[PDB]
């Protein structure tokens, strides 16, 4: 009538090969002595031998304050009614902190089945000598979809923040790495892991910044859970029998992970970064002040477009950043988690200080255009013959545009670097096209006075490039057919604009111009970055940096000669452009289909432990732009007495 | 030595009052006969009497294919280390479909504790005669945070979609209502419920549209889970002892819910809606064709701004809609779920057809301005004296702006109505300010020819209103201090613009103008809607609809007389404005802090079972705008012979 019930004492680190049926329940009693200042983990492992799909085993682990249960072989789900079946299951047991200095704690394991056949299982309860993580010591382990793991880290003395870096040398088991507090239970299942805490799907890398003020116990759990399907990490899926009713044996895929918890930049990294920024971008101001005191003693549309954008920029990103602030789902903003230093609510504060160069060099330029205009008007009371003939008609209206577009760049990008994304991308790099545009009009608008009608001619072209990026944005991972057709339609524009400016060197002019477009084509074809609007920016400068040379070479072959004061700004502008494009090309693939794949491109800080490569791009770009404004400005200053060459140049 | 183990037969619908200690385990054996075409639910209920916090009961329900376990009193968590403790727990048992026509199925209940004191519990397994929901029949039930519930709905014959409407006559227990398939297990816990399926947090209402193609079993589970804290529904929290270590007794709060699953519009509602739209908006075209054949026989900035917006509009919302498409978290887009008819990937397709009036009446207007220009130029070959003196200088350049801004409105709003939101709001209503702006310039630019300098004067003002909405957007739930200070700064603008146009009626002019601003102030102060940019739109038309009257009243007191052809468009424009503002004011509070609160304002469809109030607003607004363009156009057609009154009017 009544079932057998076998109660038997058991021991740690000793494997039991028993069996149960529908008329048999096995109960094992384990005990262990726990101590306050040395915590251990108890990991139960079950494994059924050559089991038929009739009816599973039912395993219950009973502790003083918790009941855990599962059924073996454990069945997990897929997307489209796909079941995966695991013969072997494991769990680390959650247990609350011990109230005494040391106490004996019992727990029980209960094995029962409702199938009428002898089912042979294999049980083993082991003690983990590696449960407590250490600061600065790599630790490696294994996990599968039926064997989730978790470890404990407790903060050292006086360390107020850490970063947990987890790495894997192989791509496709997926994973979720959650960071939870040390209160039982622990949510280490495919459906519990995203309930609370802050987490990150990985493929090869994950990195999470943790601070004490979120964990009043001064400790937390790092939880690793492997997933049954790799779609969330950019992987494909097969199904030969998978969609059928029966489950699919999937116990053959493991993930081998390494975890390292290391201290973060304490506080003086922030001071060093701020002092570096201020020093380098005020050296320019001091240099200009001394330069002036030496040498002297020897419109609304651009702002409104940004204003009618910045508020949508401010509102969109803030409404989008707050999710990770409250949800902990860190697969939403595409930071560089290995170099991302929080301040207040900002996650990557260093990716915002970097945009101080645009602000403070777009403001130093406006203080040059203003000083040139004022000085020129202070000359107009003396009435020298150089009104507009002995020199060139001064049109600062589009200088002010250049000096104020550089300012808005240090706000469109500083606000974009709050949660970089795909929907969020167009704010920063697309507005550098404007500066690229204005740097082209000047050299045209210098040899052609009545170009105010042509000023609006280029305004139409700028939206097309934004539309072209938008057209590329419509399919961010578009096929080659999009890429090559855009590549070939690029090829037409090579000779198309070359004809506008066109005599031996003009036939030589076609040599370097067409090559670069052809050169830049292949590096696009072979790579095809997910980021396209950033790609075309490179074509922007490369043609722009070429077109300076053309204006010089034609000027090189006249009686007009280049003075050093507007020449020393040509070599240094090109040197900084060379460096700036090096760090620009470092991060160009570091944005891909999914955050898991976009995260295996992260890399540590470089400068003062604070700034990465993309911060060094915000630095050199704002100096190259400013270094190019003074080229357009000073270049033709030797023509302060000539009225024939300047007038009949074009 | 070994524990007692009591195995005892049990019965449904009969309560057991037993006790266990650390040396006693109780096991109850239940059985029940299940049948294929009649499914029942088995609900286990446990309740501990006057239990001390020493060590809980541990309850295990063991079935053939599933093990369920919990611990009583059950502890749930809060946000800031807050624990809530429930003495009574209940679960409905998941069970896979029976393979035979009828079979006997056993399950077991296992009660055990590790505390050394007699703990007295109360167990009851009951059978539910109300597990299978029916189509079109309200069903009411109770639930708490420790007693989650779920019911089964199986599709009737030939019904391809249903809507599940759940309602509660009281606000603050929160809830999550998930819709899952009928494969075990069921995720009805505070941490499982959001794993899969599509769900909705409610406060008083929820409504979810379900389609067979997602559920190949032709059935699903409606799962209701009550939450321990009401922050996600806009509620506050107390904590007198709550933040302390001990848990808080919280078994005193219930939620009483009603569930109704009703069939959705089959297919001809879509046909009726499309036919209605086409008929009403082509009656205008046919009417104009007959009107012309009767009577005759008797620039880039506006598009570029939208183009540099529409692509960000298209990209942002599409990148934002796809989340609910793949996540099922329907607390992301602020639809009207009671009237939201899907088509393809679009969730609310009727909120897009409604924007056909802007497209097809912004296009019919451009075919009037074009015909007036062509006819006028076909007259300029005859050279009548009415070039610009006997009439008024024709400036269609800003007519084209009006006729093309109405077109872009039917795309900015049609794209906004793909996931209405807070970040997403500015796209639709802010661009109706432009049409409101251009409707003001015409009457000004008719009495003042050289107003091209004043054309850009108002362009600055438009961004300020957008900035004012943005300033209001920065704190969407801002305090009164924002609201009243903006209200009083409004009061200055009352007399400020009144002075611009200013004689007895001009002193009367101050009567109605200031009152409306004062009138519109209180209805803002008393209500203070979360939607502010939509509020100021009302102030937009109200002043705009007033300023038409002023131009008439001054015209009413001259020798100039109003012909009926430009008068019959004045009464009908005002009638449609009156109706349009009625349906506009229906949905004005239907957007609040949280989607749960924003959803208790939903209301059923009105017209042809397809269009709600806000669709009737897209309909009447596009006819009122068009009805106002023909006022600005035809009004002063009687001045086709006068050159004194027109010239010296202003
Ligand atoms: C707690 O468990 C330990 C096992 O880890 C028990 O110690 C064993 O007791 C059995 C009883 O005969 C024998 O195998 C040995 O005496 C012990 N083996 C080892 C490896 O220590 C211990 O008795 C248990 N304590 C209680 C109170 O049950
Ligand atoms: C994690 O799993 C890997 C894969 O099984 C283990 O590496 C293997 O260990 C066995 C034991 O001798 C051998 O087959 C080889 O040494 C390893 N095979 C390889 C690397 O292909 C590894 O030992 C497991 N444990 C850890 C901590 O990594
Ligand atoms: C299945 O459970 C039912 C109870 O629902 C059992 O029927 C009862 O059996 C006990 C045994 O003495 C008595 O209370 C009555 O004979 C029955 N009561 C009722 C209300 O039916 C039944 O015996 C069980 N079947 C098996 C095979 O165990
Ligand atoms: C749901 O819970 C409510 C609240 O307890 C129940 O309504 C009460 O029922 C008891 C039973 O007689 C009485 O106190 C009153 O009839 C009700 N009190 C009220 C309405 O304040 C209700 O019966 C429960 N069940 C359902 C299906 O609603
Ligand atoms: C288990 O039950 C069987 C009855 O089938 C009987 O051998 C005895 O009661 C139990 N066995 C032992 C070893 O106690
Ligand atoms: C800390 O643990 C060690 C382990 O040997 C032992 O001295 C004792 O259990 C604890 N002592 C203190 C001072 O915490
Ligand atoms: C150790 O735990 C026991 C529980 O039985 C209890 O007496 C107390 O918490 C601790 N012992 C002492 C002497 O404090
Ligand atoms: C295995 O089955 C045999 C009979 O087939 C019987 O001895 C018992 O059910 C099982 N043996 C065990 C549990 O040792
Ligand atoms: C329960 O165990 C006790 C020993 O404390 C003893 O009465 C007997 O073995 C069991 N009771 C019954 C009624 O079988
Ligand atoms: C359906 O259920 C009824 C219940 O009385 C019974 O006729 C039988 O179990 C089933 N019959 C068919 C035809 O499915
Ligand atoms: C009913 O279930 C039993 C399980 O014991 C099995 O014989 C079969 O699935 C069904 N019976 C028949 C006669 O088909
Ligand atoms: C209640 O406790 C008494 C002794 O305090 C003992 O009879 C047994 O543990 C409990 N009584 C039951 C289970 O009937
Ligand atoms: Zn950047
Ligand atoms: Zn609308």
Numbering used by the authors:
A (entry chain B), B (entry chain A): 24 to 321, 450 to 653, 685 to 832
Show me the paper's own sentences about this structure:
Notably, the only difference in these three structures is that an additional dense area is observed in the map of SIDT2-pH 5.5 plus miRNA in the region that, on the basis of the AF-SIDT2 structure, was expected to be the CTD. An additional area of density with extremely low resolution was observed in the map of SIDT2-pH 5.5 plus miRNA, we cannot reliably distinguish whether it belongs to the protein or the RNA. It has been reported that an arginine-rich motif in the CTD is capable of binding nucleic acids. As the CTD is unresolved in the maps of SIDT2 alone samples, reflecting its intrinsic flexibility, the binding of RNA may stabilize this region.
The systemic RNAi-defective (SID) transmembrane family member 2 (SIDT2) is a putative nucleic acid channel or transporter that plays essential roles in nucleic acid transport and lipid metabolism. The TMD of each SIDT2 protomer contains eleven transmembrane helices (TMs), and no discernible nucleic acid conduction pathway has been identified within the TMD, suggesting that it may act as a transporter.
